Amino acid sequence: MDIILGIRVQDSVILASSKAVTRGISVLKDSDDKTRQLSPHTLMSFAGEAGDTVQFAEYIQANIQLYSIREDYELSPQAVSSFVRQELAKSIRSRRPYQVNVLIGGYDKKKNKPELYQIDYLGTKVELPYGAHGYSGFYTFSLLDHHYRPDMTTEEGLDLLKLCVQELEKRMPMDFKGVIVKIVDKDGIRQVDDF
Amino acid sequence: NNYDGDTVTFSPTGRLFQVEYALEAIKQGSVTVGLRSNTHAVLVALKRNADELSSYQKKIIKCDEHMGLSLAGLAPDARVLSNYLRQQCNYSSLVFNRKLAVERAGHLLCDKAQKNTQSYGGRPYGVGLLIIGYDKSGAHLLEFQPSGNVTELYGTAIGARSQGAKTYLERTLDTFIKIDGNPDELIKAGVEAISQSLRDESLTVDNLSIAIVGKDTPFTIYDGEAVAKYI
Amino acid sequence: GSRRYDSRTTIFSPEGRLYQVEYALESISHAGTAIGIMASDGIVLAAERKVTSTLLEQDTSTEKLYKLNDKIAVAVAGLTADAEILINTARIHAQNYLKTYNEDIPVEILVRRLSDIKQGYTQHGGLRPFGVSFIYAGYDDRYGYQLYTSNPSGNYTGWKAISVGANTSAAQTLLQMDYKDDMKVDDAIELALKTLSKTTDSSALTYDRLEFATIRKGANDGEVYQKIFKPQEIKDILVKTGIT
Amino acid sequence: TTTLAFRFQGGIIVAVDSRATAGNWVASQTVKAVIEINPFLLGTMAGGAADCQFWETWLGSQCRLHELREKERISVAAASKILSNLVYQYKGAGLSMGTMICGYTRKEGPTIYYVDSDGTRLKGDIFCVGSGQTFAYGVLDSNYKWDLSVEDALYLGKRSILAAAHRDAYSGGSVNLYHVTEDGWIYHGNHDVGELFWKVKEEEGSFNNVIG
Amino acid sequence: GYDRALSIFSPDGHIFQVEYALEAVKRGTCAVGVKGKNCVVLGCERRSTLKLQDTRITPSKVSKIDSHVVLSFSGLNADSRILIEKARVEAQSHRLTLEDPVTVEYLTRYVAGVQQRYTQSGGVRPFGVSTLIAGFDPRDDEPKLYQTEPSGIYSSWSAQTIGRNSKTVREFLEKNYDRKEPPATVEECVKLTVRSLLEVVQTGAKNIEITVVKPDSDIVALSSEEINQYVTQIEQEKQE
Amino acid sequence: TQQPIVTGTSVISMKYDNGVIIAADNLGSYGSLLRFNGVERLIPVGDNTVVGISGDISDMQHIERLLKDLVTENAYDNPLADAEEALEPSYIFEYLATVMYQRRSKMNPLWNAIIVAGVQSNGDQFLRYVNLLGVTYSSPTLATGFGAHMANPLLRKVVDRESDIPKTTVQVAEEAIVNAMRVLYYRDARSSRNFSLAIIDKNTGLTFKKNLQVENMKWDFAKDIKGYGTQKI
Amino acid sequence: DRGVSTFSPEGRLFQVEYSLEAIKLGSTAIGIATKEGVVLGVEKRATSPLLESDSIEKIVEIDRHIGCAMSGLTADARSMIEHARTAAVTHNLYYDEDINVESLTQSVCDLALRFGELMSRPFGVALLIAGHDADDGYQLFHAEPSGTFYRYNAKAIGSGSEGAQAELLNEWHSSLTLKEAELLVLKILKQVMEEKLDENNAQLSCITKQDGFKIYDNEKTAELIKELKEKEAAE
Amino acid sequence: QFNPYGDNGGTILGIAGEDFAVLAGDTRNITDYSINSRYEPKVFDCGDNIVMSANGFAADGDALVKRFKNSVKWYHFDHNDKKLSINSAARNIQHLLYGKRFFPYYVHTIIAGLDEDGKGAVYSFDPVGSYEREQCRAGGAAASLIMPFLDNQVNFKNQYEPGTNGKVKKPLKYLSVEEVIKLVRDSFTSATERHIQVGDGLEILIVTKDGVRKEFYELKRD
Ligand SMILES: *[C@@](C)(CO)[C@](*)(O)[C@H](CC(C)C)NC(=O)[C@H](Cc1ccccc1)NC(=O)[C@H](CC(C)C)NC(=O)[C@H](CCc1ccccc1)NC(=O)CN1CCOCC1
Ligand SMILES: [Mg+2]
Ligand SMILES: [Mg+2]
């Protein structure tokens, strides 16, 4: 767990997440998918303390899927993000808090708009055009401030994202073994296999 | 009649009918005999079967190296009470490095049965027990009834047709009490005692059940070919 | 012990009915009639107050119609005290949902949970059921305008027009006769009042013996407004339809 | 410890050392670091001996209860997740475990799950765990191919443990080999490092840094 | 807490509360389940004494437990919601721990276990509900149809019906359903299900609900016009 | 988690041919302050057991109450309470040893070191130690605190092993105990001159001696000692 | 009404005696013990022909060395089996060994009387528990809701129990082979069953030291049924 | 702050033969630099031909042995007087130890007896329950002194056949009870010389099919 990025463009939300899983002085895996599909049009990436990350993500996934079956209806990204924030807000004052930071990328079918939410382990929610967790932000934010435009296409967003990964690969101390990129739009969630 | 719905109700004449109905379950149970001398204490039990294809219901249970009982009535209730005795015997050993007195064993059983006769919801125990043992004051024989009443005796018997064996022991009292340092003769007296409660059936090899405890004898149970000597 | 005095409220009859639920429904059938009618552009809630006294304070009174949130209201039929217990629970449940999801609670979800509470009292706990039947009138962005009813059994169903309380048999026949799908709110208002006027056990229907409420999109642009009618407003709407 | 397990054409190889230490004191040279959950599942042991032993035996009981209730063999995924969910409940209490749950089923094929005491659960093709994991990784990575024969794969797993046993002070004793197939696992013997080292040195021509 | 033993044995060896719960099921609207060669169909009666209903929002008779399993019922409607909720929760819990969706047998066994628990627990009455649970196991194309009842017994059926006048429709299915050759297609299976309900229902308008379940989480509910076409077709063939 | 406040120092004891002897001074120290001087730290249980206690005095008084209550409880429904079913030293010890270990296991110990000395019903000598940790051991000689360091060496010269017990008389054994108490008065800064001594014999029973004093002390040589090295005056 | 844990004037628990009447209404189950193994067989009794009979699970595995057959209110047996399986596996975990058949039966029977005003009523199901261990060998137990269990050489429970038990009395001897026992269960089941016995409405099972507990296939049982009919016609 | 643990010293040793097994242990009990007892046994006959010792913190050691003896007692009650096999006892002890994983028994535990084939068996445990069957095991204060000697003399480690160019190892073979006791006595006299916590006395418990025999030997008392 280390690098997770998110970019909201005109018609979609793009999430990029590092593939490396490191423990001690060994990279145990270089093909790890740090994300879970919460619903057909909502995707959550995550990063933080080992074990807590997956345990939290799957717990949220189970709850949202339960809701979908009960109501035969998909919750809006805004509704899901609020539910997630509250769970983390509860967690921070627990005996042992979830040390997990998340990005929630979703497409609202009622509004026909993409939405990106950044939520840290304290339960601090913000809607953003672009977001990051960890040390990644210290490079990407200033880069996106410069190059990002609100009316960009998905292809323009992917090029903008490539620019971020290149900068991280140049200046970051740790080898994070590249990223898995996923796109969320009106047609649902799909993975970019060649990045 | 109107006063037997539960154990918490007294009858107009001051009787507890649920306790009396529990006492009735013992009378239906198979006969078992208890007797002792000064050196040893013996339990003899007539085991009962469902049919020729079935096994014979085990009547005797070991509680410690120096104590154990025989049952008559509801067997599961005997299992609960014997388990409680095992724990109490065991508590006495671990905490005080002390073998539990047979008299205290009786007192503990009395108090456990009593609580079930004064509270709503619960029921009385439906079993009678004959506890034998050898402690610091020699050999002992107790009779437990689920009313709570525990009684120390030289000899006794409980179950169906137990009056026959109880009469015999009342006649033989002076003889068997002085059978000291002779296990086999004390058992013989107990086997002859239980024989006074037999009707149509006789004592066979997988029917009879004997147990003994004494001065230099741990509580041990004899079944099968080990009781063929006494037929 | 105490077994002797237990009524056993949560058991089946030999015919497979829940005694207490059936007897609670019998109780509700003597309560003042309450009608709900759903139109294409709004919902009407009309209810008859139980034999009014002339010295009853009418303007500062609430017996039949209660507000659950800004988008949902209920009409009550049965024990008012029982209804208020359930109403406060429903109000809290709506706020819990808003707090959790930052969205107003969908009508059915609120109805289901309130109905699930009633169900519990019929299956476990050994307590008497709530002697209450509700008519839920509300709006959300999924299904739009909705009418539901729940009863002591905890069973709920959706409706276009429905009555609870007294004379529901006669009232439901009259609603079934004159109701149609392309109906407006103003027409539904007239139907609700006319139905009560004919099914009432009173001599004549007057403003002081009624509670009335509408849920329109009559506010300014794409938003819902709840109107709990004042005494003078009921007096005017009663004259306007030619009942008095 | 040094333990490894890798996926290949012919199933799964599991290889471990047999050393146990209390500081610099070598407590045992004959420890069983592979635990037989059942005839089809293996679990490796690294970290706390008791924690691994106790809970992976417990895991076998849970796996047995599963097939009694469902009349079907438990998946490697489900078995590993029972263990990971258990240790996650004890997170912060001080459990020390680094295990690999290895198995072969019909729906999954050969599967390895790394499960660790801080809650991590990873599916993967190759894993090395223990104080000598880096030494084993070095030999394994440089010689690993998917199209290894069963004979060559068994040797690679053995040779990788030997590499760690040599360099890592807290690894050694002997090598225990396992081959896992759909029909179950097959034990491929205990190999004393004392005799194995000299044998490999001579036959392979490696370990020139050592005087032979 | 309320502790009373409501479900108890009688002298003749019967548990009347469980048997009276079956009477509540007998009162409920008819529900039918028929499984074909590559599908299962769940048919349900809706009583027509209720006009002025809003069918958009009214609770549907067939409920999705997961994307691949469905549950219909006969008996007390309020009681059914509790079983459906528990089943839906267990479905998600199974996916979370086993990393695989429930089998239809497992889900049935769970629901049946819940029903049984309420027949020997203090302070509760049995569920006045019998269920028909149908679907397809993960990565499997064999159709599954199970039935449960208040006592807690469950079993698998080639075809089955529950509710009021269920003995009439069971009589129909027993002679019309061939074990050696089940309904080969979706149309054949739906038709047999509609036919069986037409023995009991009254009119084939807004009284019959049909839900078709196919492999790999393919579930769809038929509309009024779609069902009415089956009703129109069957009646014309009948006049012969 | 505790810290001892008012404390009692060494308890010493040994076996002899027909029984056991046990002794302890009558002081209750409050740190360096020798606060309380009338403290009895030997507590008889029946006529066949004496429990000697060192360490925290508040916890000692608690243990006194437990032993007193134990005697009461044993008499309940017990016709042979003064005969066959009387309390044995082994019973009393095991009870305390159970309590001490339970209390240490709850991280709330009784801050004591205890020696149970007595004679069993069959005449056998009983002497066993238990402390705040629940640690137990038996030996021909037993002592707590400073007594372990200074008394045991002296008492072991008399009874070095099991075979020396029949050869040791009550006169010789008492002499050694009294000598040991003098040495502790010389060398233990939290000790007093006044002490109590108890003898439990299989023939003569329990003999409890109060208000004993250390005597026949050697101090005269002190007058010759001048300065710390060179000083002549 | 009246208390759940009440004694009758004759000295029996009303609810326990009433649960025994429920067991008499249940489908027949038969067990026979031999030196070569123990055989367990049950009547399935499908309520309707549309019901898929293979889903009727009235014979059940507890462990590799212990099997179980049931009769009565079969839904009540689920928690009893769950307990038995847990008890068997738990003992293996604590003691690294198989658990004795008698000890397993005792563990199940401890649940029986844990009812009152714990669960609300006794179990309405009887169990035949068959198994093998190193000490006492092949065993068959009859576990009742009274909390009592008897060991049996042979035993029948259910609606046709008294008629079947009288038949087992004559037919059983100590030198019965496993094959002879299999046929004897089928023979006696066919006698007491309402509908005609075949592979679909009856099920066989056994437990042997070598192969453990096994439920027979419908193909295997069908051949034993055919072998049985031929042998009766042969004299 | 109160420290619930202590070190009572001492050392123990378990060796397994073909048809027998021994479990030895010194009889000295200590705290810091003081001797508490010169004869305080810590090797116990627990019944069913199982001998046991739990060395380290004596209070925890006594509690464990006491609990296991009690476990054996209840095993007979619950399972028709069945004999508790050494392997079943080992697994039971694991659960006793691990039951206090978060407040451990500070002891090294060893048990000895015969397996179900009649062959000698020794099992050793760490403080929290990890166990292993072995031919040979020393535990306690002087385990580091004794154990490598056992590796050399019992399992013949580092010993090669003379003249074979260090190619043929010395063959493994079972030792007689006489040869084993010689190694035990020499192990303890050597440990007594070089470890201050070891001495006073040596008590050996030998286990055969006939039962449990005892042997006692003096050790240096300094
Ligand atoms: C390589 C060999 C090194 O990591 C492997 O990782 C092996 C795996 C094998 C053993 C399964 N790991 C160990 O050998 C492991 C190292 C270790 C120890 C402690 C924590 C993490 C890793 N060794 C142990 O666990 C040893 C095994 C013994 C030697 C058989 N055990 C101990 O060190 C024990 C208990 C340690 C402990 C763990 C958790 C809570 C409390 C304690 N300690 C002692 O035996 C110490 N001594 C015993 C005698 O009595 C006084 C205390
Ligand atoms: Mg090394
Ligand atoms: Mg010295």
Coordinates of C-alpha atoms in Angstrom, one line a residue, chain E residues 7-164:
Chain E
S7 CA -44.5 -24.2 21.0
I8 CA -45.0 -27.4 23.0
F9 CA -46.1 -31.1 22.6
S10 CA -49.6 -32.3 23.1
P11 CA -50.7 -35.8 24.4
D12 CA -51.1 -37.1 20.8
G13 CA -47.5 -36.0 20.0
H14 CA -48.4 -32.8 18.0
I15 CA -47.0 -29.3 18.3
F16 CA -50.2 -27.3 17.8
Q17 CA -48.5 -23.9 17.3
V18 CA -46.5 -25.3 14.4
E19 CA -49.6 -26.9 12.9
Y20 CA -51.6 -23.7 13.4
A21 CA -48.8 -21.9 11.6
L22 CA -49.5 -24.2 8.6
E23 CA -53.1 -23.1 8.7
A24 CA -51.9 -19.5 8.2
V25 CA -49.9 -20.7 5.2
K26 CA -53.1 -22.4 3.9
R27 CA -54.9 -19.1 4.2
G28 CA -52.2 -17.2 2.2
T29 CA -52.3 -16.5 -1.6
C30 CA -51.2 -19.4 -3.8
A31 CA -47.6 -19.7 -4.9
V32 CA -46.2 -22.2 -7.4
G33 CA -42.7 -23.2 -8.4
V34 CA -41.9 -25.2 -11.6
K35 CA -38.3 -26.0 -12.8
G36 CA -37.6 -26.8 -16.4
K37 CA -34.5 -28.1 -18.2
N38 CA -32.5 -24.8 -18.1
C39 CA -34.7 -22.6 -15.9
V40 CA -37.0 -22.2 -12.9
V41 CA -40.3 -20.3 -12.9
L42 CA -42.0 -18.9 -9.8
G43 CA -45.7 -18.1 -10.1
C44 CA -47.8 -16.2 -7.5
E45 CA -51.4 -15.4 -7.0
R46 CA -52.6 -11.9 -6.1
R47 CA -56.2 -11.6 -4.7
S48 CA -58.5 -9.2 -6.6
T49 CA -60.6 -7.9 -3.7
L50 CA -58.1 -5.1 -3.6
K51 CA -58.7 -2.5 -6.3
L52 CA -57.3 1.1 -6.2
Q53 CA -53.9 -0.6 -5.5
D54 CA -50.5 1.0 -6.6
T55 CA -48.6 -1.9 -8.1
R56 CA -45.4 0.2 -8.6
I57 CA -44.7 0.5 -4.9
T58 CA -46.6 -2.4 -3.4
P59 CA -44.2 -5.1 -2.1
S60 CA -43.7 -7.8 -4.8
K61 CA -44.4 -11.4 -3.9
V62 CA -41.1 -12.7 -5.3
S63 CA -38.0 -11.4 -3.5
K64 CA -34.3 -11.5 -4.6
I65 CA -32.1 -12.9 -1.9
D66 CA -29.0 -12.5 -4.0
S67 CA -28.4 -11.9 -7.8
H68 CA -28.8 -15.6 -8.5
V69 CA -31.4 -16.8 -5.9
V70 CA -35.0 -15.8 -5.4
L71 CA -37.6 -16.5 -2.7
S72 CA -41.4 -16.5 -2.9
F73 CA -43.8 -17.5 -0.1
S74 CA -47.3 -18.2 1.2
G75 CA -48.7 -17.1 4.6
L76 CA -48.2 -14.0 6.8
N77 CA -46.7 -11.2 4.7
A78 CA -45.1 -9.4 7.7
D79 CA -43.4 -12.7 8.8
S80 CA -41.9 -13.2 5.4
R81 CA -40.0 -9.9 5.5
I82 CA -38.0 -11.1 8.6
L83 CA -36.9 -14.4 6.8
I84 CA -36.0 -12.5 3.6
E85 CA -33.9 -10.0 5.5
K86 CA -32.0 -12.7 7.4
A87 CA -31.5 -14.6 4.2
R88 CA -30.1 -11.5 2.4
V89 CA -27.7 -10.8 5.2
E90 CA -26.5 -14.4 5.3
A91 CA -26.0 -14.3 1.5
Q92 CA -23.6 -11.4 1.8
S93 CA -21.9 -12.9 4.8
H94 CA -21.2 -16.1 2.9
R95 CA -19.7 -14.1 0.0
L96 CA -17.5 -12.3 2.5
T97 CA -16.0 -15.4 4.3
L98 CA -16.1 -18.2 1.7
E99 CA -15.4 -15.8 -1.3
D100 CA -18.3 -17.5 -3.2
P101 CA -22.0 -16.9 -3.4
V102 CA -24.4 -19.3 -1.6
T103 CA -25.7 -22.5 -3.1
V104 CA -29.5 -22.7 -3.3
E105 CA -29.4 -25.7 -0.9
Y106 CA -27.3 -23.8 1.6
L107 CA -29.5 -20.7 1.6
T108 CA -32.6 -23.0 2.0
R109 CA -30.9 -24.9 4.8
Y110 CA -30.2 -21.6 6.6
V111 CA -33.8 -20.2 6.2
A112 CA -35.2 -23.6 7.3
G113 CA -32.9 -23.6 10.3
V114 CA -34.2 -20.1 11.3
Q115 CA -37.8 -21.4 11.0
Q116 CA -37.0 -24.5 13.1
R117 CA -35.3 -22.3 15.8
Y118 CA -38.6 -20.5 16.3
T119 CA -40.4 -23.8 17.0
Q120 CA -38.3 -24.6 20.2
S121 CA -37.3 -21.1 21.4
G122 CA -38.9 -19.5 24.5
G123 CA -41.1 -16.4 24.0
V124 CA -41.5 -16.7 20.3
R125 CA -44.1 -18.3 17.9
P126 CA -43.3 -20.1 14.7
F127 CA -43.2 -18.3 11.4
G128 CA -46.6 -18.5 9.7
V129 CA -44.8 -18.9 6.3
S130 CA -43.8 -21.6 3.8
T131 CA -41.3 -20.5 1.2
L132 CA -40.3 -21.6 -2.3
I133 CA -36.6 -20.9 -2.9
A134 CA -35.2 -21.2 -6.4
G135 CA -32.1 -20.4 -8.4
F136 CA -28.8 -21.6 -9.8
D137 CA -25.6 -22.5 -7.9
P138 CA -22.4 -20.5 -8.9
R139 CA -20.9 -21.7 -12.1
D140 CA -23.7 -24.3 -12.5
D141 CA -26.5 -24.8 -15.0
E142 CA -28.6 -27.3 -13.1
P143 CA -31.9 -25.7 -11.9
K144 CA -32.7 -25.8 -8.2
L145 CA -36.1 -25.6 -6.4
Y146 CA -36.6 -26.0 -2.7
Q147 CA -39.5 -25.7 -0.3
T148 CA -39.5 -24.9 3.4
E149 CA -42.3 -24.8 6.1
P150 CA -42.9 -23.6 9.7
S151 CA -41.7 -26.8 11.3
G152 CA -38.3 -26.3 9.7
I153 CA -38.2 -29.3 7.3
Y154 CA -37.0 -28.6 3.8
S155 CA -36.7 -30.6 0.6
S156 CA -36.1 -30.4 -3.2
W157 CA -38.9 -30.4 -5.7
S158 CA -39.2 -30.9 -9.5
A159 CA -42.3 -28.8 -9.1
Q160 CA -44.3 -27.6 -6.1
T161 CA -47.1 -25.3 -4.9
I162 CA -48.1 -23.8 -1.5
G163 CA -50.9 -21.7 -0.1
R164 CA -54.7 -21.7 -0.6

